[PDB]
Amino acid sequence: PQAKYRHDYRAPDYQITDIDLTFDLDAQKTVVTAVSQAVRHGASDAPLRLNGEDLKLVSVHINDEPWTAWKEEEGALVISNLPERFTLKIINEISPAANTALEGLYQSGDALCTQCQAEGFRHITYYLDRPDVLARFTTKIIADKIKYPFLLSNGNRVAQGELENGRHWVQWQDPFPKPCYLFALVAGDFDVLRDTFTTRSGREVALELYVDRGNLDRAPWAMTSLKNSMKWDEERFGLEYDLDIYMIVAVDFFNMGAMENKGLNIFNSKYVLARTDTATDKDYLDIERVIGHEYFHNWTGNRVTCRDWFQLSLKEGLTVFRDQEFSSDLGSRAVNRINNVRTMRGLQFAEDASPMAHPIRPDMVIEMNNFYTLTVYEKGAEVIRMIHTLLGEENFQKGMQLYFERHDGSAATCDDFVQAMEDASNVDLSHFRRWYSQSGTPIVTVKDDYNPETEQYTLTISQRTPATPDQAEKQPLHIPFAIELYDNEGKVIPLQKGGHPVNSVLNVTQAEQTFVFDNVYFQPVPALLCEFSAPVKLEYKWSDQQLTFLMRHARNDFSRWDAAQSLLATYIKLNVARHQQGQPLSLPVHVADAFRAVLLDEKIDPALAAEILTLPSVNEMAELFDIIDPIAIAEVREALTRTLATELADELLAIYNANYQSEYRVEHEDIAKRTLRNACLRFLAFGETHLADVLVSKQFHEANNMTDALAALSAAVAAQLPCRDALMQEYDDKWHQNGLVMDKWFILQATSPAANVLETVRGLLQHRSFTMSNPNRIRSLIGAFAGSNPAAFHAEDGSGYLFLVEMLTDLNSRNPQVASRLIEPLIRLKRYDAKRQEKMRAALEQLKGLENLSGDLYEKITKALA
Ligand SMILES: [Zn+2]
């Protein structure tokens, strides 16, 4: 399998302007007839090179002439000797029922549906499967009426009829030219929730949500979120929907979260289906986020698409930024920012330190599906957010307007987007562009000095990015570095120099630079990298008292949570070193006191209190260390929880009780209270055993919602309480028929601290609610074990690696995309000790020798073993 390089981009020799598709649909054998209008742009002797994978070719005609001048090759149909403009007709067969990879057209339960990103359309017919080829689609679908009463594709229904032998047909037309990755087709029998949205200019849009029969009770929240998303994009970005119908289909079998196919999104049902007894506050907020995300792609992705797949961040980073702004505008901005920063620090930073490290605009790709990553999405969004920081909302919106004005109806590049931002704002972004082409996390080191004779505060700031496996050379970036200075009363000291105000976003552009501030009347406590103003690691020699001062006085809630994180980092690092020497936890009294003060503070937003009282996960803790000791990290996290539970027992129980809510509401004040209450519960589960057991068991049984029932169940598992086995069995007996609800239970089983966790996980491969045919089940059981239980995955006997190898040996053949997601914990070997590395290398060498090794795994394994 051959690498492809961004620098090799070349305009296509042929364009296809219009394509008329017919599907004679059947799960065993689908016949596709594709009639394309092609125009040559390249040299008159250039052949037409169509992509195709796993297709049975039936015929090729050019202007209705059976064509003799073609050859099939690996992944291609090469057609020679063509006129300048012509009608191409291809007939080919495919088999949805045999498509276990879930790429192209496949079977999802009884339904047929598509997943065409990045390059799945070539699994349906021979085509120019590249996103700079934009065609107007019309799609006719012919199927058995009883099996497939609903036949959906992009756009509007323009014809329909019935046939003999119990078949019917529908034809769809989408007036907007589109790259083929936005093609979608759905056939099946569904319940449909129907509603309407009227755009600000008065266009009435029919909204239709298709769910499996019986699931209509779980549909209204997603419909509500869709209307919320539409309204918000109008208010915030001035964008309206541009078609007459918006369809969403929820499918159980889906390798991704959701896809933005024009006017016909297809969603993993995990991001659609919610009822208060089945779904948590977090599920509700995730549905909102992902409904919004796919809706926001209508402009940032669809009306302006990607010239090539190396530009993936152009749509994904910008759309993630938009979904974050949506969630933040509608909810708690501080909570959203906190959560996204934890994802950056705990998950993305790890990827940027891995063999798969890549810039947000990659330079080299073997399997494009390997690059739908935390880097392209989450760091890509941090990069858009830095442009927003540098320009401010007004200029940023001007740049959006110029971007759409220039690029509406075409495929664009990351560079085009930056250029629009720069032209609209008159902010020079040429050094800034380096964030697109350099991989790795910068480390920003800050030293300060207060001069009492001159009343000046000096920050000496430096930056470096360590070399990564993909790039030996690194250069300084344009780092927006937001600061705030506090006097001893907690008041902000105006920033100024030489009689003029200074902007609080510093431009850190050099390897080393000094910034001097005048009229600093008192020695300041600084807040640094405010609101995580750049995606970097900060090195500053904090005192404990500077941090607790900030937790008490910082103006932005983010800064208070972030000061607590820096405070905790110090003692997590201390206690991991202690664990390694056989010693128990040590924590100064004044550190527990800072957390007591948060619990008892009446003025603090419960949303903030809740996040400060949620300890960093084992993955966030891992990023504090050069060499990861996952067993010490897990045990230290538990010991810290036990220590805080003992020191704060009375305060924890008071706040738990005060935040009781008899009514369940999916509303941001109610959610904040309940998140605080359940954060208290986590600690309380580690109190005196009988007391803990009673409290947890009672919450589980009296819960009037899944958020509270799951928080109880999770605490019983985490603290290994006596009630655990009974509660876990009760949930199984109640919920086994419901895969999405069982995913929560598989996760708890997979991440359990019990000594026998792997044995339990292996037995659950035979559980009635588990199946290897379903990516959600796989991710909930196997993926959560390997990625979210590193202590057990990295068991010293190497049993975790051997288990993952057995699972990937199956999935490599069955569903390479899911296999490649799941291999990720194994490729982090260089972060671990020598003895672990050699077992992990051994596991990777075993996988490398697999017969029919997928390109998806090949790419990661070869990087990991380099
Ligand atoms: Zn997206």
Swiss-Prot record:
Q: Where in the cell is it found?
A: Cell inner membrane
CC per GO annotation: plasma membrane
Query: How does the cofactor attach, per the note?
Result: Binds 1 zinc ion per subunit.
Q: Pfam families given for it? A: DUF3458 (PF11940), DUF3458_C (PF17432), Peptidase_M1 (PF01433), Peptidase_M1_N (PF17900)
GO biological-process terms attached to the record: proteolysis
Q: Which GO terms describe its molecular function?
A: alanyl aminopeptidase activity; aminopeptidase activity; identical protein binding; metallopeptidase activity; zinc ion binding
* Transferase found in the keyword field: no
Q: What's the Enzyme Commission number for this chain?
A: 3.4.11.2
Sites where the protein binds Zn(2+) = 293, 297, 316
Report residues binding substrate. Answer: 117, 257-261
Q: Spell out the residues of the site Transition state stabilizer.
A: 377
Q: Which SUPFAM superfamilies match?
A: Leukotriene A4 hydrolase N-terminal domain, Metalloproteases ('zincins'), catalytic domain
Report which superkingdom the organism of origin falls in: Bacteria
Q: How does inactivating the gene affect the organism?
A: A quadruple peptidase disruption (pepA, pepB, pepD and pepN) does not grow in M9 minimal medium, does grow better when supplemented with casamino acids.
Topological type in the membrane:
Peripheral membrane protein
What are the record keywords, sorted?
A: Aminopeptidase, Cell inner membrane, Cell membrane, Hydrolase, Membrane, Metal-binding, Metalloprotease, Protease, Zinc
Provide the top EC class: hydrolase
The active site lies at 294
Q: Do you know which InterPro entries this protein is assigned to?
A: Aminopeptidase_N-like_N, Aminopeptidase_N-like_N_sf, PepN_Ig-like_sf, Peptidase_M1, Peptidase_M1_dom, Peptidase_M1_pepN, Peptidase_M1_pepN_C, Peptidase_M1_pepN_C_sf
Would the keyword Cytoplasm turn up in this protein's UniProt record?
A: no
Q: Which cofactor does it need?
A: Zn(2+)
Q: Which reaction(s) does its UniProt entry say it catalyses? A: Release of an N-terminal amino acid, Xaa-|-Yaa- from a peptide, amide or arylamide. Xaa is preferably Ala, but may be most amino acids including Pro (slow action). When a terminal hydrophobic residue is followed by a prolyl residue, the two may be released as an intact Xaa-Pro dipeptide
The similarity annotation says: Belongs to the peptidase M1 family.
Q: What does this protein do?
A: Aminopeptidase N is involved in the degradation of intracellular peptides generated by protein breakdown during normal growth as well as in response to nutrient starvation.
Know the name of this protein?
A: Aminopeptidase N
Q: What is the lineage of its organism?
A: Bacteria, Pseudomonadati, Pseudomonadota, Gammaproteobacteria, Enterobacterales
